[PDB]
Structures are given as C-alpha cells and as structure tokens.
Amino acid sequence: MKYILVTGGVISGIGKGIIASSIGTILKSCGLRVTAIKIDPYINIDAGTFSPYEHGEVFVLNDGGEVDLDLGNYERFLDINLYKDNNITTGKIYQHVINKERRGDYLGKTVQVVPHITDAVQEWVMNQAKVPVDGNKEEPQICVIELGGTIGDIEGMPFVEAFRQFQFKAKRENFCNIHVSLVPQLSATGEQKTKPTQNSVRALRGLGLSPDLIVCRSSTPIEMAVKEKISMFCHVNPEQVICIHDVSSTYRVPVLLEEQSIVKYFKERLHLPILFKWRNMADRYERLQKICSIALVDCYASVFKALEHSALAINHKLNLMYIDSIDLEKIPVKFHEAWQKLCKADGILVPGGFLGKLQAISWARTKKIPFLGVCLGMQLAVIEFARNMRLGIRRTVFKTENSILRKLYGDVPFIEERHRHRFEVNPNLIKQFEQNDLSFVGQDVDGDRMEIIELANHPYFVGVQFHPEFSSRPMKPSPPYLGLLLAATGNLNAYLQ
Template sequence: MTKYIFVTGGVLSSLGKGITAASIGTLLKHSGKKVGMLKIDPYINVDPGTMSPLEHGEVFVTKDGAETDLDIGNYERFLDTSYLKSSNFTTGQIYSSVIERERAGGYLGQTIQVIPHIVGEIVKRIKEAGEGHDILVVELGGTVGDIEGLPFMEAIRQMKHDEEVAGTFFVHVTLIPYIKAAGELKSKPTQHSVQELRRIGITPQMIIARSENQLPKSFKKKLAMSCDVHQDAVIEANDAASIYDVPMSFLRQDILSPIAKALELGDLTPDMEEWDSLVKKIVQPKGKVVIGFVGKYLELKESYKSLTEALIHSGAHLDARVEICWVDSEEIEERGPETLLADCDSVLVAGGFGNRGVEGKIKAIEYARVNKIPYLGICLGMQLTLVEYARNVLGLDDANSIEFDENCKNPMIYLISDFLDQNGEAQLRTHSSPMGGTLRLGEYPCETKEGSILRKAYNGEKIIYERHRHRYEANPAYREQLEKAGMIVTGESNGLIETVEIKDHPWFLGVQFHPEFTSRLQSPNPSILAFVKASLEVH
C-alpha cells in the first residue's frame, strides 16, 4: 500500500511548498523509491487554462494534455519524470465531479454535503494518484486557515485513520520572520500556524522553517518544543543560490531520517552525486552566455518559468551561466532591436497570446535573421518567424496571422479548426475550450528532416515527442513559396508544420511545440541545449 507525505503551508503563500515537496520527492526517488507527486489547488477554477499569466503565472501542460499548476513543472524538472493530469486537481474539479454524479443519480437521492461527499471525492482522488507508487508526496496549495482549503485539510486528516493507507507523514512549511529593528527571529507565527493545524486535527511531524537567516540551535530547539516535533525534524530552508541546491541542503540536514523512521522505510541513502555536480556548475560555472529573451509578460517572469529553468538546465550541462537579458517586445517597437539586443549573443522569442507586442517580436526575429545571430522561436515565436519571412523575403507586405488580422489576404497562420475541417479531426487529439476555439494540447510526435539542425539536436532521432499548447497553426498553403525562398520545414506532425529553419543561417530554429515543458535538470531538452550551445560558441 502507498504511504503519503502531506506538505502544508502556514503564515503566508509563496514560501516554497512546491520546491520543498519536489526536493523531498527527489531525495526519495534517488533512494530507490517509486515516488508520485500530487498538487491540490483550492481555487474554484476548474484548471488554470483560462487564467491570465499575470494572475497565476505559467500554465504547465502535461504529457496527456492537462493544463495544470506550474508546480507540476517543478515536480517533473526535479524528479526527471513525466506526470499526468491525475497529479493535479482543484476545488472546481471536485465540485464539478460531485455535482455531475448527483445530477446523474449517483448518490441515490442523498443530501449532498461537504462531509462526506466532497471530502470523500478528495480522498478518492488522492488514493488514485498514489496507485502504483511506494510514496505519494502531496502538496496542498494555499495556507492553513484558508476557508477554501478546509475540505482538503479534513480529507488528509481522515487519511491518518484510513485502513487502506500504509502510513502518513505531515510536513509544515512556515515563515520565520526576522525583525530587523529588534534584531530577533520570531517563532510566534509558526506556533499559531501549527495551533491552527492542530485545531483541524493534524499534528505536523516536521517543520520546514523558511528564513533568510540561519537559525541558531537554541531557536530550533525552541521551535521544536513549541511545535511538539523532534529537534531533528526542524529543517531550515534558507535562501539558496539555486532552487536545485535545496535537496542538497535538506540532505545535509538529514531530512530523510525522521521521514524514514515514521513511515518505516528503512535505511535511505540517496545517490545525489550527479545532481550535486550539476548544481555546482549552476552556482559557479566556467563560462557565460547572454540570451536576449523577447517576451510580453516581463512584469511577472513566472509566466516563463519552464523556459527560464530550461535555460538553466542547459547551462549546467555546458558549464556556463546563462544570463537572460529581458527585452520587452513593446519596447522594441518604440526603440528598435539594435538598441536592446546589441549586447546579446542570441535571440529567443517566447510564446504568448494576443497582439500586444507582436510587431516588436517580428522586428527581433528580423534582427536575428539578418545579422546571422543564433535564434530560437517557440510557439508564437515560430509563427511570427513565418510572418516575418513572408513580409521581408517573399515580399507579402500584408502577411499576418489571423489571430491578429482575421481578414488578412496572406494568412501565414490560421486556426487549427480550419486544418481539421480539411483533414479530418481523427488525426489530432484536440480540446475544445468553454471560451470557444480548439486547443492542441499535450504530447505529439514530430518527424524530423535528415540533415536538419533539429535532427542533429536530437542526436539523429527520426521521431521526437514534444508538448503543445496553442490553437493556431502554420498554413501549409505557403510551404512551397517559403522553401523556394530558403525557409525549410524540418519537422512535421500529422501533416502540420512543426519546425522551420533557414538555409543560409548558422543556427536558426522555429518550433511550434514547447520544448521547455520536457526539460529537466538531469536531462535538458535537446533543442534548447543546442540553442544555448550555439549561443555559447558566438560568445
């Protein structure tokens, strides 16, 4: 039977519950355990797919096409594993499921209540996520005391007494504030947070103390006594030079001993040698490269979380620091790419929705193409690559995407539904959005062209698999014109154009998929790794 580790948070949000959960999972996996990960989000949205990147940060896409919380991305990057839609659920999904069952008569006329029906559905989903694993690490979003989180707290409390559960362990992540004027660390917020947990019926067995400063032994002893945990179960989580150093910090504090003892896991000795070597290359690399990152959500860089982490992964494997030069595409429209990208070794144009900043991205692409600078365009970045080439090389001045101009005479990019109308829906696994439109989500195969940058990046693989999240596609009607003019299609999927390159350019690649979703610390994505390597050669 599966054993469960529950990670809760107190005092305030954004303390690093996701990194804590991923770090514990990583250490257990490297100890030979089969580890599952689950993120529970108390918000009422069914999923983050319709939420603004400025509101929620990045929407992560799983292999099977689920739009999930960005913490699932952290889990995959840390544990080098692909998780599925069962690794994330929300309040919205729970209530929708219960209401649908009630409407279908599934409860045989019972009065539907939070207890037992809502809580029962939560417990069922947690157990389903734990199937096939030795241990399931469950991160509960929000903070203790949030009204929307109470049913989830009740669910994990009940699981302590469930005969189908082999064991439970409760980890509480909490803030230790430092009052500068008094020169003191304060434990009272943690004590109150733990008291609130106890009121619910949960007694934490480990405290992860989030602090900017190192905690004195006397303070840790006080914390252990006031929170009723063993002193060796008070683990410091200080600010780290890299999030990937957190597992090593936890290991140095022997975090696994109290967990192993409580869950009867035996001796746990994780092999973290390769991990430690990569972290050292992140913190103290030999080389350096500067990448011009052209985007439109720069006020909240969490919107590009997977991509920035993917660049770090590649840098670690190339023993180089990847410095990101953040460039607002709207600013390029005003000041020009020469001013903002002159000091960059390469140019990356990221994905996004909507027409804000699009012309700035097109100017950045032209700058990289004309000046023979290494270039990587992702999703919208690839689509605009076609638009730029059509305008400035083919001479189609009105070329555009119908996302930005529905009536343009030369639609280089069109809706996926138009492709489906012509080619049959059976070719693709698509998802209809309640807001209208059709999204291509999840993993798809891509056939690479012999001799291409793409195939070389993927070590000669003829078929590769990458993830998608978009509703617009490259229009194949212009393929012949583009290829005659030097832009070659080097990747295809079920008749769709997946990647393009330019003949007379040293390194230029546009990809319709999101390679960042499959990049991990120990196995960086091949196309991003090749891009960073090409950038490094320029530097």
C-alpha cells in the same frame, strides 16, 4: 501506499513545491517509486482559465492538461510524467460531487462537505497515487501531496478535514505531514521570529493534523534558540524542526535536506526499505563564470529553467535579460534600454503568447545572431521571412536528416513533444519558402502542419510549434534551448562533431 502531505503556513511563496519536489527526489535517490499530487484550492478547472501574470505560466502535460508551473517542478525533480488528475482543485471535486448527486449515486442522501466532498478528495488521492506516473508500469510506493494555499484559508478547509480523516482511514506507518512555514527575520535587530509558525501549527493542529516535520523557511540559517522555541511551542522534537534558508539554487535544496537527516525520519516513520548529481549541479552552479547573454523578447518559468539546464550543461552562466516587445516597438527611453539589450544578445529567444518580436526576428535573421522561436515565435518567423486546440503530446516527423535540431535530438526520425496552439502554417503556401532559405523541416504525421522551421543560411535560426521547455530536466537539457546556448557561445560546431 505511503503518503506525505505537505502543508503551508503563513504565506504561499515559501517554496513548498520545491521542498515537496526535493523530498520526492530524496526518496527517489533512496530507490523509491514516487508519485506527486498537487491540491490547488482554487475553483478553476485547469490553468487555461488563467493569465500568465496570475499563477505564472500554463504548464502543459502529455495528456493535454493545462496546469500551474508547480506540476513542472514535480516533473523536473522526479523525472515523471503527470496526468491532469494529479492536479486536484475545488472546482474539479465540487463538480464531481454535483455530477454524482444528479446521477443519484448518493442514493437520495443529503450531499454535504463532510463526508461527501472529503470522501471525494480521499477517493481521488488513493487512486491517483496508484497511477504509474513514471514510465515503469509498476505501482508507486510513496505519494507526495502538496496542499496549496496556507492552512487557515477557507478554500483549504475541505482538504485538511479530508487529510485529518485520511490519517485514521490509513495508518501512521503510511501517512505523515510536513508543515512549511515562514520564520520572518526582522531588519533592525536581525531577530528571527517564531510566532507565525507557532500560530500556523496551532491552526493546523486545530484542523486535526500535527506537524511530523516543521520546515522553517528563513532568510539566514536559524539559530539554536529559534529552533528550541519552535520545538517547544509546536510540540515536535528539535530533530523534526528543519531549516531551509535562502540558498544559491534549487539544486542545493535536496542536499540541504540530507544535512537535516530527513531520510532517517522517513525510514523510521514511514517504515521505508531504505544524491551526488544534485551536489554536483549545485557546486557547478555556484562556479558559473562564463556569461551567455540571451534576450527573451514566472510567465516563462519553464523557458528560464530550460535555458539554465542548457547553461549548466555547457558550464556557462545564463544572463536572461527580459525585453518587452512594446519597448522595441516604434511607440522612447525604454527603446534605448531594449535595443541596447538586443545589441548584447548572444541569442534572441521569442517565446509563445496569445509586436517588436518581428523586429527582434528581423535583427537576429539579418545580423545572423542565434535564434529560437517557440510557437508564436515560429509563426512570426514565417511571416517576417515572407515580408523580407492542438494540446499535449504529439509526434513530429523530421522531413530530412539535414536538420540541426535532428542532430541535437540524437539523429532520431521523429520526436514526441508538447503542443498548445490553435494556429498553424497554410499547407498551400509552403511552396513559396522551400524555394528559398527557410526550410520547413518538421511536420506532423498528417503532413498538414509544418511544426519545425530552420533557416539554412544562418548559424542557428530555428522555429518550433511545440513547447520543448516542458520536456527540459537538469539531467537532459531541451535540445532547441541547448542549441541556442551552444550557438551563442560558438560551441555548436564542437558539439555537432
């Protein structure tokens, strides 16, 4: 296969995953079948071990893998369905080698990091690159590998050593390395400094990989004198020093890379047989004037992106105002902030988790303000109506054609969406609710779990057990989120017509 490693320098928050995902959609626009692998040098096996504050949200894959939000960036940019083994971690590879050792698979030889851990990385990358990750069963052409962390962190040392070897245990026609690095810009002088990028490239080149492209991330576009220092000290041509400055949106990052001519580089280097929409979406995003103010009651990064996809599609600006449920709760300055936000809420969003959510539900229910409840927001909705693990892709069957979500999903009798919940509605008690305004509208194939609710005597009050955020992509807004913004702007009855 053809392989593109993306390494990071100086600091991890430079957006390497957006760059890597951007080059993947560039290559896809050039007609290529692109895979992605993310290396996360953490010793954790799956992101289910994390808090939402640590690594952002737990993105959920079709196979039930729990991963950090950057596999959602590859899914959203490439329109791809990743498997749990497209995330490589140090825990996953060390445990693999330890298990092989105990099985005698290393034939009584001493197991050690080089070669055995480095071979495990190569074995895994070669095979997961070949996985059909598009819906097309045809073997991929390119694999973009993001090496997470910063080159020079101790946890990354097996992977760069593996990738050093992988140059030679392949061809230069088949492997290149992108180094993404911070070019810090000083306050008082405006001066862009190249020293961290030079030092990071020196470290990377000391690990036996050379930058084939250097991607500068900078606050402002870099000056030619700055690009000249980088091309001289990092021993790469000026045409191989790319600048991605702070832009308006992720839609503009692929467009910017065409305007740095990366396709000519990848054609020449990787010997490749080679956007519109990203321009259009960027150009639209920069012109969004009509505010839709929604109350959310990187912890919710797919939720925010799903709303922005929906907002863009209806040519509105999202104003996502985040409210803690403890602010709305009876426990008082932040109460008069939170409830004031909840007054100017055109829609209420109660996402998942593991108290004032119930008050926001009551507010939305009573005042007839548009509501989307996801996972816990469905369960709390059922609960508060009464007062007044299941992991990965599953089929949800609609119990009727008289469903607003069914119209938004395109009249289909069932949907396949991603789940992540341990708790569900009691099958014996459903007959308390069916008599009244809260219809249970979607169920599993087993008929035990109700998985969608709709409140009938309301513009749009829906609850879903699945996370339809993980299915959201710019080209196809997540229908439960689209319905929320359509309802909040009154356009729902025009769309459903």
